[PDB]
């Protein structure tokens, strides 16, 4: 089990850091060319860190002091430990410490229990932005308490005592709204939403009293599907052990209100129909929902009965709730716009750190970093957004509460995301190995079917001049992270490498020794 | 079997009338908005009435007294009885008795045996036009007698005695020419031709004597895809399959025998090279050297029972003298022209009732009714055409014998068929639910992708000006019959709804709750 | 055994001749239609003549006086004798059958104090000659001693035949050994091949690298053997030194290409070696500096193959065009001088398109080989003795242009592209049975013949009875096959069709 024991060091959040693997007894770094997405997934799984968010090569969390291992992990991605992974050691030189690999996993939450008589109950205390703080009890349900107790290994939660029972706590209140269903064993797996979360009374601090028996386990259904979020999508209901849809007959805002308040998504904005979020694959359970908009559950409405319908899947009902938040850039480059409460709105530029811009760019899936620009008219929704390290979406980023207020264009935020594609380890900026950003991490392109047309499309994507050479076999050096593309069958005139046909987004049989490079004109 | 026992009432012909289905023990009608073509087909099949001809909603056969059932028959179409179909009842009332559904089935013949000691023997009598007439043996073969006996549940026939053995006949003599093959169960399944049939001797009347034993049971050749009974690809049946001729050395002499076998007289054209389509099925007849005098296709110098050596693209077809075709010349408004004996000619206007014009319009497939117009150079074949109820083709209609003669311009038949498209349940004639006529019954257009281009096409096809609003989800009520069109992708400039791309003429997953509608300028 | 005792007579080379199966006491020929590929294979095996090369019909080796047998041999193929095969008793002497087996070598020992010892002599082109020891290794001596029933070899001390025998030592006969005599260099008169065999028949030999999917002997993906499984070599740092090592190890001269990226197809086996650091001087590939057995970070998409100096390929460039031979990594022409009809037939058959061809005048590329003299029996040009390889410039007058008759043909037809369909396979002109012979089959046949689309697909022997055997029946052509050989059907025998069921085609004029 300690054959290749991984660990994360150099990170300021629990499940991110420079990857160090212990070969028996010596802790040593890993070059980013020897650590694929599958190996990072195995590393995050073994450390109980959840799913891999990003592979950060080039010593993102600082260079390690010691020795660099020369083994390329050929993990299949389903392994439980890094010891079970097959590796391909190389006798020759390995790498430089300026290219150590770092991995960001998804369990960054760092929530604990403080000021309790028995070690595992008390005031819930959360750490974001480098400072501990009390969580608000407005959205601290018993399911969140159950997940927290399971994470701290004390079984289930007895109660969430409201008020300052365990103490108000010396610090500020964190407004994060954990949306745990109770079925997950870590608060980092829960969908948390801290953007614009409403202010909290000082004395309304969340707490929890766990059962304390580890052997004690939780014992026992509506969901929204294909909505591009959490509070929108096709209304899917569960009955007779099957996920079924609701026909959009007489499906109005009252029905949407009921399903949105049942899911904890606030009121509703749209009661969509005609399969707005895609046709479902399952029996239609309800046909004519006659909810008054006041009851707390959808099944307790005046429907036609389970399975009693005259509808098809082409008209499955779906909803868009008030708590449905969306993000976009309009002119990636343009004005940052957040879609909350059914209305698009700009984001305040105040306290917009580099981390927040990077989070926005990663969320939009077009860069790892970005920069704020002056304006090149809609009101401002949120302001003072402060993204910590670890969230790949803006909605987990604490900020001032939502306020529908008018904003001058000067103090809104315009950001230009960095290039999707970069050239690394080259003498100039127009030559080197092709790197592309997708899926949270920088990756490479393999040299299979890497002719000069692919070099042409890469050069015209970076803005460089015409392509000169399309190198193969990692001429400029082995790359970082996963191999996103191989067999790119470009015609040489595409607007970007993404439109070019290829075996896309991982699963390429190529290694990092076959990294594709280009030589553009200065 | 009595759970849903259908019956047809209010019809002058045997196999048509208002649809009444016994829901256990109470007789009640069915609304026309919850009776598709599959349910009508099951109804016709169960009642031993052949295939369904047309679904006539709106109390075509009369107002049904009693109760209306709100059960939407979800019949697949192949059920033996209506009791075996899925049922999707709705709690609310469906419609009034003014929208009772009616169904016309194929077996309208009403043929019987009269003036016999035993019920399985006597003079053949037939009922068309409300008159019990005595069929005569001009074309009454032994296959017709066998089918008549089998229909009457009397096993097989013995002989067809000539003269007035069972009586001359108390009334007038029908000239119908049944072309039974001896295998179909009912005389209504036989292809009958009574148009222009030759005058028949008064003392020669068809009579049949059967075996009288229900246990008795009987122990081929056909023309396919020719637009009639006496044209199309020649098909020979043996070894349980139907096969076509290779066309090689397929002369008019080889066509004379195949035409005289079916009773279609002499042969006009001996076609080939898939002239009537690509005939799927093994080819087992090649190098036909028929001399013409013989009366069987298999009696020729056949190369062998399976010496295919050919392709379905070289399939043999024939055109016979008794092949009949109909058209309107001036789309489907103009002079009535009938194609007999290889020439086109007019049709006499004398005794041309509304039923005959409706039959012509249905057969040409462009309306359910029509109207006689004044004249607005070819001879006249047939005159005094009298269509009864039940036939959808003009060739099953008794008429004066084919008399090639010159006729004045003031006595032929000019008809203008009704519009293929209509708007129902609207305040004005240019607003309401769009209904189209196809396949014998008035269906509706579903609302899937029913935009204003569709409404523009419909409004310009009706006859009035531009559209105002293309309605959705049965704004003016659920329509009658099937749903012919859905997902109509009109460009907005098509002259008629039939030019727009669509999922046309059935197999549409829509329901009558999704009936498209329009609003046109008055 | 003597129930059906076969023999080959009327052949110049040892293991070829007209088939004459003996019915106990009387020898009698066989009609060409009553003898299939499996029967010929069993015949070749029984007479210790190795595998069958071709079945020659129409009295290729003359007509044998006697009684022709009407029996039909339903040999499965693996029978050790013609007696053991099932027989189906029920022709003319002009249709007698002959077979050419693969052990045509006729190599012997002369001038020795013992019958199992002496100088090696070989007989090709009808003249006994002294094979010499330019490439006479100890494996060839072992194979010769085993063939002569002399045990194993001990040491190797008319005109001179320059044949190169590439025996591995495990071959029971010289005909089984791969032999290359095309363009072999001259050889000193005093330097000839000899062998002293042990003379102990009870004595036996005792105990790998290979190239596969190369279309020859000295090219293809490098397969190395380890731990009981044949594995590949990754092409990482697989430069020309590694190819030199694996080519000189296999006796294939120097190397022209060290191919990678699975040029000769992706192997199916564990990649054994990854980073070959051969200096080009060691005699074995495993003696190179590598990452070690099994240590590799490669896939099968990058298997390492080579193309060696002795790799030879044959092509015709316009199956008609100038004859070209690919030796030493460079394509080149073949000399027209002394181009006998046998050599043209061998060339046409090796191109896989005929059994005969006509020498034609030309309608630049330097010349490799000249004075090529193919004997009877080889089916490849590489085994035909000739003048040595020489890189020289030639005018198109002395170049070789050959127009071979393609395997598909139509015969007894009013036009060129009408008649019964006949194919060529195994040295005999067969006919296709009209089982499921539809217009798709005729389309394929007409497209292969090079004329317009088919008009009719006749049956029932429309254009007369075909000669020879029947190779094809129940051909399921889809109408778009380039050649009739790509159509999925039971091919080259195992057909009960008679000549009355010969298929025919009618194409456009
Ligand atoms: C939601 O409703 C608003 C207000 O009626 C409308 O503007 C918007 O287009 C709707 N969006 C969807 C997806 O239905
Ligand atoms: C890229 O092209 C430039 C322009 O010819 C050349 O000077 C440079 O050496 C090239 N780089 C490589 C790595 O070949
Ligand atoms: C049929 O034959 C007649 C002549 O008898 C000719 O006028 C007509 O065009 C023919 N029609 C076809 C379809 O061959
Ligand atoms: C059609 O449109 C006009 C004008 O918009 C409206 O007055 C009329 O009521 C509409 N027709 C129907 C049936 O509603
Ligand atoms: C072999 O090497 C020569 C030398 O450049 C080259 O021209 C040829 O294309 C190569 N062939 C293969 C199959 O690699
Ligand atoms: C080939 O077909 C054409 C037309 O189908 C015919 O005229 C010709 O005689 C045929 N050739 C034969 C049968 O050899
Ligand atoms: Ca919560
Ligand atoms: Ca609906
Ligand atoms: Ca509702
Ligand atoms: Ca409904
Ligand atoms: Ca590669
Ligand atoms: Ca490419
Ligand atoms: Ca009849
Ligand atoms: Ca034929
Ligand atoms: Ca023909
Ligand atoms: Ca004929
Ligand atoms: Ca719809
Ligand atoms: Ca449309
Ligand atoms: Ca040798
Ligand atoms: Ca490689
Ligand atoms: Ca090397
Ligand atoms: Ca390697
Ligand atoms: Ca075929």
Curated annotation (Swiss-Prot), chain A:
Q: Which residues are glycosylated?
A: 270, 519
Q: List the subcellular locations.
A: Cell membrane
Induction conditions: Induced by anti-inflammatory mediators such as glucocorticoids, interleukin-6/IL6 and interleukin-10/IL10; suppressed by pro-inflammatory mediators like bacterial lipopolysaccharides (LPS), IFNG/IFN-gamma and TNF.
Residues in SRCR domain copies: 6-106, 111-211, 222-322, 327-418, 421-521
Tissue/organ expression: Expressed in monocytes and mature macrophages such as Kupffer cells in the liver, red pulp macrophages in the spleen, cortical macrophages in the thymus, resident bone marrow macrophages and meningeal macrophages of the central nervous system. Expressed also in blood. Isoform 1 is the lowest abundant in the blood. Isoform 2 is the lowest abundant in the liver and the spleen. Isoform 3 is the predominant isoform detected in the blood.
Q: Which cysteines are joined by disulfide bonds?
A: 31-95, 44-105, 75-85, 136-200, 149-210, 180-190, 247-311, 260-321, 291-301, 361-417, 387-397, 446-510, 459-520, 490-500
Q: How is it modified after translation?
A: A soluble form (sCD163) is produced by proteolytic shedding which can be induced by lipopolysaccharide, phorbol ester and Fc region of immunoglobulin gamma. This cleavage is dependent on protein kinase C and tyrosine kinases and can be blocked by protease inhibitors. The shedding is inhibited by the tissue inhibitor of metalloproteinase TIMP3, and thus probably induced by membrane-bound metalloproteinases ADAMs.
Give the misc comment.
Answer: Intravenous lipopolysaccharide (LPS) produces a rapid rise of sCD163 in plasma of patient as it induces metalloproteinase-mediated shedding from monocytes surface. Long-term LPS infusion finally increases expression of the membrane-bound form on circulating monocytes.
**UniProt function note:** Acute phase-regulated receptor involved in clearance and endocytosis of hemoglobin/haptoglobin complexes by macrophages and may thereby protect tissues from free hemoglobin-mediated oxidative damage. May play a role in the uptake and recycling of iron, via endocytosis of hemoglobin/haptoglobin and subsequent breakdown of heme. Binds hemoglobin/haptoglobin complexes in a calcium-dependent and pH-dependent manner. Exhibits a higher affinity for complexes of hemoglobin and multimeric haptoglobin of HP*1F phenotype than for complexes of hemoglobin and dimeric haptoglobin of HP*1S phenotype.
Oligomer status and interactors = Interacts with CSNK2B.
Domain remark from Swiss-Prot or TrEMBL: The SRCR domain 3 mediates calcium-sensitive interaction with hemoglobin/haptoglobin complexes.
| The protein's name | Scavenger receptor cysteine-rich type 1 protein M130
What's the source species for this entry? Homo sapiens (Human)
From Swiss-Prot, chain B:
Summarize the PTM comment.
A soluble form (sCD163) is produced by proteolytic shedding which can be induced by lipopolysaccharide, phorbol ester and Fc region of immunoglobulin gamma. This cleavage is dependent on protein kinase C and tyrosine kinases and can be blocked by protease inhibitors. The shedding is inhibited by the tissue inhibitor of metalloproteinase TIMP3, and thus probably induced by membrane-bound metalloproteinases ADAMs.
Q: Origin, by domain of life?
A: Eukaryota
Give me the disulphide-bonded residues.
31-95, 44-105, 75-85, 136-200, 149-210, 180-190, 246-310, 259-320, 290-300, 361-417, 387-397, 446-510, 459-520, 490-500
Name its cellular compartments. Answer: Cell membrane
What conditions trigger expression of this protein?
Induced by anti-inflammatory mediators such as glucocorticoids, interleukin-6/IL6 and interleukin-10/IL10; suppressed by pro-inflammatory mediators like bacterial lipopolysaccharides (LPS), IFNG/IFN-gamma and TNF.
Which residues, renumbered to this chain, are glycosylated? 269, 519
Q: Which residues form the SRCR domain?
A: 6-106, 111-211, 221-321, 326-418, 421-521
Report, as the record phrases it, the tissue specificity of this protein: Expressed in monocytes and mature macrophages such as Kupffer cells in the liver, red pulp macrophages in the spleen, cortical macrophages in the thymus, resident bone marrow macrophages and meningeal macrophages of the central nervous system. Expressed also in blood. Isoform 1 is the lowest abundant in the blood. Isoform 2 is the lowest abundant in the liver and the spleen. Isoform 3 is the predominant isoform detected in the blood.
Tell what the record comments on domains.
The SRCR domain 3 mediates calcium-sensitive interaction with hemoglobin/haptoglobin complexes.
Relate the protein's function as given in its record. Answer: Acute phase-regulated receptor involved in clearance and endocytosis of hemoglobin/haptoglobin complexes by macrophages and may thereby protect tissues from free hemoglobin-mediated oxidative damage. May play a role in the uptake and recycling of iron, via endocytosis of hemoglobin/haptoglobin and subsequent breakdown of heme. Binds hemoglobin/haptoglobin complexes in a calcium-dependent and pH-dependent manner. Exhibits a higher affinity for complexes of hemoglobin and multimeric haptoglobin of HP*1F phenotype than for complexes of hemoglobin and dimeric haptoglobin of HP*1S phenotype. After shedding, the soluble form (sCD163) may play an anti-inflammatory role, and may be a valuable diagnostic parameter for monitoring macrophage activation in inflammatory conditions.
Subunit composition and interactions: Interacts with CSNK2B.
Protein name per the record: Scavenger receptor cysteine-rich type 1 protein M130
**Which organism's genome codes for this protein?**
Homo sapiens (Human)
């Amino acid at each position: 089990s300690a054959h290749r024991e991984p660990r994360l060091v150099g990170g300021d959040i629990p499940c991110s850091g420079r990857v160090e693997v212990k070969h028996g007894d010596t802790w040593g770094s890993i070059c980013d060319s020897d650590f694929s997405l599958e190996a990072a997934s195995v590393l995050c799984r073994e450390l109980q860190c959840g799913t891999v968010v990003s592979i950060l090569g080039g010593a993102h969390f600082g260079e390690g002091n010691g020795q660099i291992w020369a083994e390329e992990f050929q993990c299949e991605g389903h392994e439980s430990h890094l010891s079970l992974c097959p590796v391909a050691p190389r006798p020759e030189g390995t790498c430089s410490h300026s290219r150590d690999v770092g991995v960001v996993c998804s369990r960054y939450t760092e929530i604990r229990l403080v000021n309790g008589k028995t070690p595992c109950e008390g005031r819930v205390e959360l750490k974001t932005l480098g400072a501990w703080g009390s969580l608000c009890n407005s959205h601290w349900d018993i399911e969140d308490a159950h997940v927290l107790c399971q994470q701290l290994k004390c079984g289930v939660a007895l109660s969430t005592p409201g008020g300052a029972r365990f103490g108000k706590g010396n610090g500020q209140i964190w407004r994060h709204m954990f949306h745990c269903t109770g079925t997950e064993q870590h608060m980092g797996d829960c969908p948390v939403t801290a953007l614009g979360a409403s202010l909290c009374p000082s004395e309304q601090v969340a707490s929890v009293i766990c059962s304390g028996n580890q052997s004690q386990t939780l014992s026992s259904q509506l969901r929204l599907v294909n909505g591009g979020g959490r509070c929108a999508g096709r209304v899917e209901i569960y009955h007779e052990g099957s996920w079924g849809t609701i026909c959009d007959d007489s499906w109005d805002l009252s029905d949407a209100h009921v399903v949105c308040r049942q899911l904890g998504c606030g009121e509703a904005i749209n009661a969509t129909g005609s399969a707005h979020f895609g046709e479902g694959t399952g029996p239609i359970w309800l046909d004519e929902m006659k909810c008054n908009g006041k009851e707390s559950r959808i099944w307790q409405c005046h429907s036609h009965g389970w399975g009693q319908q005259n509808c098809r899947h082409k008209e499955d009902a779906g909803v868009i709730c008030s708590e449905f938040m969306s993000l976009r850039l309009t002119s990636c480059a343009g004005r940052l716009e957040v879609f909350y409460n059914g209305a698009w709105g700009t984001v305040g530029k105040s306290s917009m750190s580099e981390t927040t811009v990077g989070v926005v760019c990663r969320q939009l899936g077009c860069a790892d970093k970005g920069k704020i620009n002056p304006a090149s008219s809609i009101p401002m929704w949120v302001d003072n957004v402060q993204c910590p390290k670890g969230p790949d979406t803006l909605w987990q980023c604490p900020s001032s509460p939502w306020e529908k207020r008018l904003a001058s264009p000067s103090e809104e935020t315009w950001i230009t995301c960095d290039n999707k594609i970069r050239l690394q380890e080259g003498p100039t900026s127009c030559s080197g190995r092709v790197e592309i950003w997708h899926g949270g991490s920088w990756g490479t392109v393999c040299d299979d079917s890497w002719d000069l047309d692919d070099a042409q499309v890469v050069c015209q994507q970076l803005g460089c001049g015409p392509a000169l050479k399309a190198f193969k076999e990692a001429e400029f050096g082995q790359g970082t992270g996963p191999i996103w593309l191989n067999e790119v069958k470009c015609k040489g005139n595409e607007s970007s490498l993404w439109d070019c046909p290829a075996r896309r987004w991982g699963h390429s049989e190529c290694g990092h020794k076959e990294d594709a490079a280009v030589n553009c004109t200065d």
